[PDB]
Tab-separated table of C-alpha atoms in Angstrom:
chain	number	residue	atom	x	y	z
A	18	UNK	CA	-91.561	11.107	10.275
A	19	UNK	CA	-94.524	8.766	10.683
A	20	UNK	CA	-94.088	6.755	7.489
A	21	UNK	CA	-92.262	3.711	8.884
A	22	UNK	CA	-94.746	3.669	11.777
A	23	UNK	CA	-97.655	3.647	9.326
A	24	UNK	CA	-96.005	0.781	7.436
A	25	UNK	CA	-95.658	-1.280	10.611
A	26	UNK	CA	-99.316	-0.668	11.489
A	27	UNK	CA	-100.649	-1.500	7.998
A	28	UNK	CA	-103.267	-4.266	8.327
A	29	UNK	CA	-102.199	-4.808	11.938
A	30	UNK	CA	-104.324	-6.105	14.777
A	31	UNK	CA	-104.485	-4.205	18.053
A	32	UNK	CA	-105.161	-5.292	21.641
A	33	UNK	CA	-105.705	-3.249	24.792
A	34	UNK	CA	-103.466	-4.522	27.623
A	35	UNK	CA	-104.358	-3.476	31.174
A	36	UNK	CA	-101.709	-3.736	33.895
A	37	UNK	CA	-102.580	-3.419	37.585
A	38	UNK	CA	-99.270	-1.689	38.389
A	39	UNK	CA	-96.545	0.400	36.810
A	40	UNK	CA	-93.933	-2.139	37.879
A	41	UNK	CA	-95.053	-4.730	35.317
A	42	UNK	CA	-95.001	-2.209	32.455
A	43	UNK	CA	-91.527	-1.107	33.551
A	44	UNK	CA	-90.328	-4.731	33.449
A	45	UNK	CA	-91.888	-5.151	30.000
A	46	UNK	CA	-90.178	-1.998	28.700
A	47	UNK	CA	-86.792	-3.081	30.086
A	48	UNK	CA	-86.872	-6.763	29.039
A	49	UNK	CA	-89.099	-6.741	25.945
A	50	UNK	CA	-91.506	-9.366	27.307
A	51	UNK	CA	-95.154	-9.689	28.305
A	52	UNK	CA	-97.250	-12.400	29.906
A	53	UNK	CA	-101.008	-12.633	30.312
A	54	UNK	CA	-103.666	-15.023	31.558
A	55	UNK	CA	-104.395	-18.109	29.417
A	56	UNK	CA	-107.615	-16.698	27.906
A	57	UNK	CA	-105.710	-13.755	26.424
A	58	UNK	CA	-102.640	-15.862	25.632
A	59	UNK	CA	-104.743	-18.018	23.316
A	60	UNK	CA	-106.220	-14.949	21.576
A	61	UNK	CA	-102.786	-13.370	21.122
A	62	UNK	CA	-101.221	-16.544	19.715
A	63	UNK	CA	-104.100	-16.846	17.236
A	64	UNK	CA	-103.681	-13.203	16.217
A	65	UNK	CA	-99.886	-13.516	15.876
A	66	UNK	CA	-100.318	-16.176	13.179
A	67	UNK	CA	-103.129	-14.239	11.514
A	68	UNK	CA	-101.655	-10.788	10.911
A	69	UNK	CA	-98.523	-9.026	9.697
A	70	UNK	CA	-98.282	-7.113	13.038
A	71	UNK	CA	-100.008	-7.592	16.389
A	72	UNK	CA	-99.844	-4.427	18.510
A	73	UNK	CA	-100.299	-4.342	22.305
A	74	UNK	CA	-101.360	-0.938	23.650
A	75	UNK	CA	-100.630	-0.765	27.394
A	76	UNK	CA	-102.517	1.083	30.117
A	77	UNK	CA	-101.832	0.882	33.877
A	78	UNK	CA	-105.127	0.643	35.751
A	79	UNK	CA	-106.117	3.951	37.460
A	80	UNK	CA	-103.323	5.898	35.711
A	81	UNK	CA	-105.619	7.696	33.266
A	82	UNK	CA	-103.048	7.080	30.526
A	83	UNK	CA	-101.614	4.634	28.084
A	84	UNK	CA	-97.910	3.934	28.689
A	85	UNK	CA	-96.928	3.016	25.125
A	86	UNK	CA	-97.286	0.258	22.549
A	87	UNK	CA	-95.294	-2.709	21.274
A	88	UNK	CA	-95.402	-5.313	18.525
A	89	UNK	CA	-95.416	-9.048	19.235
A	90	UNK	CA	-92.247	-10.660	17.897
A	91	UNK	CA	-93.166	-14.221	18.924
A	92	UNK	CA	-95.916	-16.495	20.147
A	93	UNK	CA	-95.875	-17.304	23.847
A	94	UNK	CA	-93.180	-19.663	25.115
A	95	UNK	CA	-92.483	-21.284	28.475
A	96	UNK	CA	-89.326	-22.121	30.389
A	97	UNK	CA	-87.362	-18.909	29.879
A	98	UNK	CA	-85.670	-16.798	32.514
A	99	UNK	CA	-88.395	-16.201	35.143
A	100	UNK	CA	-89.822	-12.676	35.297
A	101	UNK	CA	-90.518	-11.165	38.719
A	102	UNK	CA	-93.932	-9.760	37.855
A	103	UNK	CA	-95.987	-8.143	40.617
A	104	UNK	CA	-98.867	-10.647	40.673
A	105	UNK	CA	-102.437	-9.692	41.674
A	108	UNK	CA	-101.625	-14.822	42.234
A	109	UNK	CA	-98.811	-17.203	41.348
A	110	UNK	CA	-96.395	-17.452	38.431
A	111	UNK	CA	-98.230	-20.682	37.558
A	112	UNK	CA	-101.387	-18.736	36.640
A	113	UNK	CA	-99.683	-17.024	33.701
A	114	UNK	CA	-99.410	-18.473	30.261
A	115	UNK	CA	-96.116	-18.264	28.424
A	116	UNK	CA	-93.973	-15.235	27.747
A	117	UNK	CA	-94.345	-13.212	24.567
A	118	UNK	CA	-91.361	-11.362	23.158
A	119	UNK	CA	-92.237	-7.811	22.118
A	120	UNK	CA	-90.494	-4.919	20.361
A	121	UNK	CA	-91.458	-1.527	21.695
A	122	UNK	CA	-92.663	0.983	19.108
A	123	UNK	CA	-93.331	3.829	21.553
A	124	UNK	CA	-92.414	4.032	25.225
A	125	UNK	CA	-94.057	7.472	25.703
A	126	UNK	CA	-97.332	8.086	27.576
A	127	UNK	CA	-100.632	9.260	26.116
A	128	UNK	CA	-103.347	10.654	28.404
A	129	UNK	CA	-106.859	9.291	27.952
A	130	UNK	CA	-108.025	12.889	27.537
A	131	UNK	CA	-106.264	12.869	24.129
A	132	UNK	CA	-108.103	9.784	22.802
A	133	UNK	CA	-111.640	10.886	23.744
A	134	UNK	CA	-112.610	11.221	20.064
A	135	UNK	CA	-111.777	7.552	19.288
A	136	UNK	CA	-114.370	4.806	19.776
A	137	UNK	CA	-113.853	1.070	19.436
A	138	UNK	CA	-116.499	-0.764	17.349
A	139	UNK	CA	-115.489	-4.049	18.942
A	140	UNK	CA	-116.488	-2.673	22.370
A	141	UNK	CA	-119.887	-1.128	21.508
A	142	UNK	CA	-118.203	2.077	20.225
A	143	UNK	CA	-117.238	3.012	23.766
A	144	UNK	CA	-114.179	5.288	24.038
A	145	UNK	CA	-111.088	3.256	23.189
A	146	UNK	CA	-109.680	3.731	26.710
A	147	UNK	CA	-112.583	1.547	27.945
A	148	UNK	CA	-112.081	-2.185	27.731
A	149	UNK	CA	-111.095	-5.296	29.641
A	150	UNK	CA	-107.543	-6.600	29.493
A	151	UNK	CA	-107.214	-8.234	26.096
A	152	UNK	CA	-109.992	-6.297	24.334
A	153	UNK	CA	-109.333	-6.141	20.606
A	154	UNK	CA	-109.353	-2.682	19.016
A	155	UNK	CA	-110.671	-2.433	15.460
A	156	UNK	CA	-108.092	-1.525	12.759
A	157	UNK	CA	-109.023	2.112	12.129
A	158	UNK	CA	-109.446	3.004	15.823
A	159	UNK	CA	-106.214	1.251	16.752
A	160	UNK	CA	-104.245	2.904	13.987
A	161	UNK	CA	-105.449	6.376	14.929
A	162	UNK	CA	-104.750	5.684	18.602
A	163	UNK	CA	-101.165	4.678	17.883
A	164	UNK	CA	-100.722	7.781	15.718
A	165	UNK	CA	-101.778	10.000	18.637
A	166	UNK	CA	-98.824	9.013	20.808
A	167	UNK	CA	-95.890	11.427	20.905
A	168	UNK	CA	-93.101	10.273	18.564
A	169	UNK	CA	-90.474	8.157	20.335
A	170	UNK	CA	-87.232	9.311	18.715
A	171	UNK	CA	-85.246	6.683	20.632
A	172	UNK	CA	-86.719	3.864	18.524
A	173	UNK	CA	-85.656	2.896	15.000
A	174	UNK	CA	-88.354	0.878	13.220
A	175	UNK	CA	-85.926	-0.416	10.590
A	176	UNK	CA	-85.247	-3.623	12.543
A	177	UNK	CA	-88.938	-4.183	13.337
A	178	UNK	CA	-89.812	-3.853	9.644
A	179	UNK	CA	-87.321	-6.612	8.840
A	180	UNK	CA	-89.129	-9.017	11.224
A	181	UNK	CA	-92.340	-8.673	9.216
């Protein structure tokens, strides 16, 4: 192992990302991209400049689980290859596209994070939060450390982007 993972998470910022469907998380895992509404896009761009790592922790609404977590590798940018998201809307509602590097593509059930509370959301269980809710450093670090190890990922290349 967990040492390189701990290094990547050192002094990181963490954000809860809530997807309405599994399809969008599958696209994000395959293409290494995410897009959000402008309110969250602005917050994520500010955070990307502010911190050594910005971590998105993903949860599909109604799934009872997190589906993994990823590190922003860029600010949002427009005009790339269009992404066929399943919109709740139009592609014009979204902000830009963020490039992300997955750190863990394995699931974590909410039942396993019941002992973690988020001070930035009234110390409610970390699973509770609107899309874009920031997770305080200690809570977010412990949450990421709860996920099963993803032995398919090598954090060597992610470390070099820091």
